[PDB]
Amino acid sequence: AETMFYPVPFNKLYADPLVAATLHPLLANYVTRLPNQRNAVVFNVPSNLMAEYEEWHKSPVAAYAASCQATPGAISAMVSMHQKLSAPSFICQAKHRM
Amino acid sequence: TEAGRFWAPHPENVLFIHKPTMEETRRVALGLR
Amino acid sequence: RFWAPHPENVLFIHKPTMEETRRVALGLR
Amino acid sequence: PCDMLVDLDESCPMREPAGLNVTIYASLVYLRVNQRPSMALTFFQSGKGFAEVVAMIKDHFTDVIRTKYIQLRHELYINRLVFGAVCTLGTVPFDSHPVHQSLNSLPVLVFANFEAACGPWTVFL
Amino acid sequence: VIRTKYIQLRHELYINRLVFGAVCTLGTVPFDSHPVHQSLNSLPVLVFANFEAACGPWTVFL
């Protein structure tokens, strides 16, 4: 894999250090020098690939998926988690008593 | 805040350079240049 | 301990690292 | 005037003895402003005894002592070395309340039962 | 009304056409006297108490 592939962390659900340390031995050096960043919620992504405040998925989404139980009820937890938090979505939750 | 009290031995301003935040703005800006 | 304010407090700047910095400003312009 | 007077016994307390005697002291400070010589006269009010107040006056004028003597790394004139002097303007009784007034405003204290006893000037530094 | 008039008179517009309205002053009513609503054969008609009448000249406005 070191002769074919390289890791690109670009999204909150797709920047994981325990996966990215396998693909290139320089990030395996980065994870083992300072073990603060071994979490997916904490891990630093380059400024040429992602800014978190200008983003849809904005880390508390990425912190739910790391602490699931992978239950069939957790599949429908995520679908009711991408619910827009705006004014004409509150009408569509108030009719069905959500 | 008086002209005669200028070089006070304990002034109100104290320099505080946080060295971990200074090294990273060096290394990022030395990467771009 | 802090240093006390005084107008004779000096910082000696190196001659080479002021000139190697001058080489960089040529290239970025 | 309330502007000139500098009180000296002031605490949270965060205990000091009472007495019969609190003494108003005068002071007069030689300094330089705008590279021109000028003086500064302030007043002091404490019943601490003369051995403490000379140490308490130097802590008040710490900044003014330092900003003057930065000059004399270059020019050392022995006439310039004299800095201040402290007189004793007479006593006030203990626990007499200084009464604030205002005139045209100019806030002006007043001391009841002030009795005067002049002293010499002694050169502190 | 000013908009929908000068559209109708966009092409031809003579100098006599420019005058639009005029405001007179008919009289005063003292405050503390509210008008009473009244119906007459049905026509909703206000009635004022103590309307003392004056007269002003017509002054053109536009």
Place this chain on the structure above:
Amino acid sequence: DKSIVVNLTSRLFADELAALQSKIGSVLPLGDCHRLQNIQALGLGCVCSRETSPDYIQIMQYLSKCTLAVLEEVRPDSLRLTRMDPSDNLQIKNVYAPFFQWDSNTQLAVLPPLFSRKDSTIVLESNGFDIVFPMVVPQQLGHAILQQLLVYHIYSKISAGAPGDVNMAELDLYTTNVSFMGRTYRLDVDNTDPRTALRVLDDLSMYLCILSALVPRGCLRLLTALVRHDRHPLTEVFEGVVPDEVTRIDLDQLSVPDDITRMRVMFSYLQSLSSIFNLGPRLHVYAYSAETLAASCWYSPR
């Protein structure tokens, strides 16, 4: 009898009693024509506040609504005022601070404080309110400030939009200073709310371009025969350089029965400009005594 008693609901002190003592016999506007009244109605500075920007048109526009009353008595618990009936002979005393000499057969009008707010505003801190006084002024300066205050809000809009348009030094001396006989006075217009001073200016631009569309041509052709031939004492604004637009309307010939219909229609829009240069109420003085400063006038509002 007619009178107005005004409560001071808390108290008042001994400094502001001497401040209200010097301001006795002065006309203030107050809110309602009730015998009983509180402190909130008497201020002209209920709209003219300190923390907000004043609006000298809207302050003046507020002044033709109110009833106007003259102080008689200052008490530490109350202020007893006497009112002014809309057709009434009464007496007014020349207390007001920029001293302008009146005489019999003059023509007064009430203006907002336009030279010194700080003189007119005395604050009543015992009740949490400040009472603000107008100034009664003969109409030769009543109009001439409103001529000057609207010229400021034209050219301040140009300079705040782009500072390269207007030189600032010539802006301050011309747009703020009011020219009077002998003296020139500096208006108190530095930080205002011009949002109702532009609606007045947005009403000039309707009357004024109508007056430019139907100028009678005989009066245009008399200018070209006067600005370059003769030297008349009031045409000297216009030098030998006539405006070029005047000569570019000369291309048609004269016609008397087509300038009667222009002189008549222009005449009835000049009668409309007395809805945009309005002062407040009017006080026709018919007697005055210069050694007592006491005028006796006739009140007629609107």
Place this chain on the structure above:
Amino acid sequence: QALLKLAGHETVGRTPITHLVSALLDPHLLPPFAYHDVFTDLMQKSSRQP
């Protein structure tokens, strides 16, 4: 099938409300791995200018 029930049938204007109630149905959220010309199919059907 479930996301098209709660989104409703009605429309605000030109834009339906199914594009505007949830983010799994809003086509401006792109899937993170694109292999096709998804970038021009978004532009021809968008009021929110990309």
Place this chain on the structure above:
Amino acid sequence: FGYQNALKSICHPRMHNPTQSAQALNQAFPDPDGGHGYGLRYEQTPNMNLFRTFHQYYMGKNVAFVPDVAQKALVTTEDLLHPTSHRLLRLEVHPFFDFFVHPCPGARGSYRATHRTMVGNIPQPLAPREFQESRGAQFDAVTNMTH
């Protein structure tokens, strides 16, 4: 008192803008220290070598910064309200938005905001893990979907 009775005042643009709320926050703490400007903005550079931009960034990195947002989603519902944490609790200003410190103007910072756009961008102290499950099981009961 349901949510549909509660909707005459929620769905109103005084509930949905920070411009009225980042000015009352700027008169509270007028000189903020804009520290690390980490997650703020996308600095674009002309590369397509994604092995280059990857390797410029992790080469000699010895200090790792955590934003204001990534240290809220790990805090529990009771640690955030305890008064030993000003700084997490200070920027909990609005339900719908998400505040941070921008380095402009001059040398002193100022407060700005980004919208959260979803229910799930509300942190775990304010929408916990077992609430998102019991809100998602209500998605199941209304649509009558079958897994």
Place this chain on the structure above:
Amino acid sequence: MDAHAINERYVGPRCHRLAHVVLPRTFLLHHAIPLEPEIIFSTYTRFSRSPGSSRRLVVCGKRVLPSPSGLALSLPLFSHDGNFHPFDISVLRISCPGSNLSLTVRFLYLSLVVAMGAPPVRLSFNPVNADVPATWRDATNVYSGAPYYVCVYEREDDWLPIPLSFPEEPVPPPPSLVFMDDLFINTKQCDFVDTLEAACRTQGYTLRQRVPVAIPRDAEIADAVKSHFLEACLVLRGLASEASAWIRAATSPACWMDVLGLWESRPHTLGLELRGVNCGGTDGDWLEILKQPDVQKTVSGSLVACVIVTPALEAWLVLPGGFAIKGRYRASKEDLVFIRGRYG
């Protein structure tokens, strides 16, 4: 689209031609133009090979709501002596009346002139109308590289093209006549830093304190303050900006200050005026500088340098720690005419 036809009546007679320009959001996102209705635009052109200044004209701009979409404007084009110049910058300055906002947007005539290439008496009533149809022609800005559209409205007209008068030999190269501003300001910045380095040599390569700030006793901090000076010489030399503080001081009729962002940690905010502070250089005048909230943070903090420009074109580089070097902008009498014409 009403904002084009308003300017043909009121900006129209004060000009020679109007360049009707519509700016899309892609152009707006780069220059960060926040479309509020309070914004007051202003236009003036900076001539070449002639005394360069024209009069400032206030131009109306209205947002277009939807076939493009964006801010609509109208740029004035000036034909001195009967013809246009190809290399002639038409400057748009964007500002709000109350708040603090100043933007400069510049357009060149070759991106505009080329894009233009394909009984009671009756009173006349000529209302403003959008009856005239637009023709939308593409354009790209030379200075940023963001596309904008140019309207050509229907009206010795069809017989001739729009005149230009190309420059003559001898000539500087047209990449160096286009950026006439960014090569004159840059060489005033590169000569300013050579005065800052010259003050180190006459002192003995030292930095002396000016501002009384206590420095914590660590050897790594004393080497870090020196690194703020050498980083400030990389930023002052690379900086070639229209809105620098010394241009504001040369075109002044007050100390003019501009803080920098060292190591690209901050964008620059330039031309801040120090109202109420007379930079005489006496020790009582540095207390009035320290009462400003920026200089308390450029000195106690880190990663920010600060330049304070007197009206006499002498400027200090203020470092964190209170260290400062007096430097001088040298502007001759010929260059003050060049600056106060095109900028002031």
